[PDB]
mmCIF file with all atom_site columns, N, CA and C and ligand atoms in Angstrom:
data_model
loop_
_atom_site.group_PDB
_atom_site.id
_atom_site.type_symbol
_atom_site.label_atom_id
_atom_site.label_alt_id
_atom_site.label_comp_id
_atom_site.label_asym_id
_atom_site.label_entity_id
_atom_site.label_seq_id
_atom_site.pdbx_PDB_ins_code
_atom_site.Cartn_x
_atom_site.Cartn_y
_atom_site.Cartn_z
_atom_site.occupancy
_atom_site.B_iso_or_equiv
_atom_site.pdbx_formal_charge
_atom_site.auth_seq_id
_atom_site.auth_comp_id
_atom_site.auth_asym_id
_atom_site.auth_atom_id
_atom_site.pdbx_PDB_model_num
ATOM   1  N  N   . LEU A 1 1 ? 53.191 94.731 60.458 1.00 10.88 ? 1   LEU A N   1
ATOM   2  C  CA  . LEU A 1 1 ? 54.550 94.427 60.113 1.00 10.88 ? 1   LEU A CA  1
ATOM   3  C  C   . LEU A 1 1 ? 54.558 92.957 59.694 1.00 10.88 ? 1   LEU A C   1
ATOM   4  N  N   . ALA A 1 2 ? 53.966 92.004 60.327 1.00 10.69 ? 2   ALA A N   1
ATOM   5  C  CA  . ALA A 1 2 ? 54.018 90.603 59.999 1.00 10.69 ? 2   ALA A CA  1
ATOM   6  C  C   . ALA A 1 2 ? 53.624 90.385 58.523 1.00 10.69 ? 2   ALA A C   1
ATOM   7  N  N   . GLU A 1 3 ? 52.519 90.907 58.168 1.00 10.17 ? 3   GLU A N   1
ATOM   8  C  CA  . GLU A 1 3 ? 51.939 90.877 56.722 1.00 10.17 ? 3   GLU A CA  1
ATOM   9  C  C   . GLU A 1 3 ? 52.884 91.575 55.786 1.00 10.17 ? 3   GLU A C   1
ATOM   10 N  N   . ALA A 1 4 ? 53.196 92.828 56.111 1.00 11.58 ? 4   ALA A N   1
ATOM   11 C  CA  . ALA A 1 4 ? 53.990 93.608 55.143 1.00 11.58 ? 4   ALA A CA  1
ATOM   12 C  C   . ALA A 1 4 ? 55.288 92.902 54.800 1.00 11.58 ? 4   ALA A C   1
ATOM   13 N  N   . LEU A 1 5 ? 56.019 92.482 55.907 1.00 12.37 ? 5   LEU A N   1
ATOM   14 C  CA  . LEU A 1 5 ? 57.300 91.897 55.715 1.00 12.37 ? 5   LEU A CA  1
ATOM   15 C  C   . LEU A 1 5 ? 57.162 90.616 54.909 1.00 12.37 ? 5   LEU A C   1
ATOM   16 N  N   . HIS A 1 6 ? 56.100 89.740 55.267 1.00 13.46 ? 6   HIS A N   1
ATOM   17 C  CA  . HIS A 1 6 ? 56.082 88.462 54.562 1.00 13.46 ? 6   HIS A CA  1
ATOM   18 C  C   . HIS A 1 6 ? 55.549 88.619 53.146 1.00 13.46 ? 6   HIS A C   1
ATOM   19 N  N   . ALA A 1 7 ? 54.776 89.569 52.887 1.00 12.84 ? 7   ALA A N   1
ATOM   20 C  CA  . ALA A 1 7 ? 54.440 89.937 51.439 1.00 12.84 ? 7   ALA A CA  1
ATOM   21 C  C   . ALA A 1 7 ? 55.679 90.270 50.649 1.00 12.84 ? 7   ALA A C   1
ATOM   22 N  N   . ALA A 1 8 ? 56.455 91.194 51.241 1.00 14.14 ? 8   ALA A N   1
ATOM   23 C  CA  . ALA A 1 8 ? 57.647 91.695 50.509 1.00 14.14 ? 8   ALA A CA  1
ATOM   24 C  C   . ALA A 1 8 ? 58.570 90.571 50.144 1.00 14.14 ? 8   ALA A C   1
ATOM   25 N  N   . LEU A 1 9 ? 58.742 89.612 51.132 1.00 14.85 ? 9   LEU A N   1
ATOM   26 C  CA  . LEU A 1 9 ? 59.628 88.400 51.013 1.00 14.85 ? 9   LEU A CA  1
ATOM   27 C  C   . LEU A 1 9 ? 59.103 87.384 50.087 1.00 14.85 ? 9   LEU A C   1
HETATM 28 CO CO1 . CO  B 2 . ? 58.040 86.148 60.160 1.00 13.65 ? 101 CO  B CO1 1
#
């Protein structure tokens, strides 16, 4: 989640 969300952002 940490990576996924920060990539999206
Ligand atoms: Co964060």
